[PDB]
């Protein structure tokens, strides 16, 4: 209890098997409530658009007693192409923030 | 099952985005190198014979060319435009001018 909110965060190099063994980690927890926000199920949005299913994702995990979320393939979820460089800040300041916002007592 | 297949002219810029691995696998389109390839384009194609032929040959086996063959169907109906005694002179001219890196 002294550590409501833990996170982690799955390297490699590409093509070696990093979004199959980030849900067998969830599948396996028994956890009530768990959920996947993936990117392509938004294909097309602009940054209002992902700023708002991403909150929509987050709020419904505050409503339980104890739950996991996947984000897989961050790099894509803002915008990124090595020339320029270029992404949207939005998003990236949206993910900096819901990173350390603790859930409601006892959640 | 489905099958993507894309079409592109220009590999480099492609790698730079890191767009290339998302392909699982990647062909290469060659152009016409060798001379007997032209000799054989142009035997197939149904355009100048005879004699013709002979004199393009001779001026050609000894040297190496660089040509796309949409742009072999071009300078052939381009050369023909002319009186039918500098249609050769005028092919070989074009060739010369466009035949470029061989
Ligand atoms: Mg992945």
């Known amino acids: 209890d002294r550590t409501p ?14 979004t199959a063994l980030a849900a067998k980690i969830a599948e396996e927890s028994n956890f009530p409530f768990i959920k996947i926000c993936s990117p392509d ?49 939005l998003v990236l300041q949206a993910l900096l923030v819901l990173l350390k916002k603790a859930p409601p007592q006892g959640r | 099952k489905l099958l993507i297949i894309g079409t592109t002219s220009r590999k480099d810029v492609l790698q730079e985005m890191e767009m290339l691995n998302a392909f699982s696998t990647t062909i290469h389109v060659p152009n016409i190198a ?57 092919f070989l001219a074009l060739l010369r001018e466009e035949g470029a890196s061989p």
């Open chain 1, 5 to 18: 909110l833990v996170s982690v965060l799955l390297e490699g190099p590409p093509h070696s098997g990093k």
């Open chain 1, 41 to 89: 199920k938004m294909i097309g949005f602009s940054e209002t658009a992902k700023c708002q299913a991403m909150k929509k994702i987050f709020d419904d995990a505050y409503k339980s007693q104890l739950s996991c979320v996947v984000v897989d393939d961050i790099e894509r979820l803002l915008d990124y192409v090595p020339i320029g460089p270029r992404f949207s800040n």
């Open chain 2, 34 to 90: 060798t001379g007997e390839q032209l000799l054989e384009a142009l035997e197939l194609l149904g355009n100048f014979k005879d004699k013709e032929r002979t004199t393009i040959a001779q001026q050609v086996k000894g040297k190496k060319v660089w040509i796309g063959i949409k742009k072999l169907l071009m300078l052939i109906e381009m050369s023909l435009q002319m009186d039918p005694e500098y249609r050769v002179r005028k």
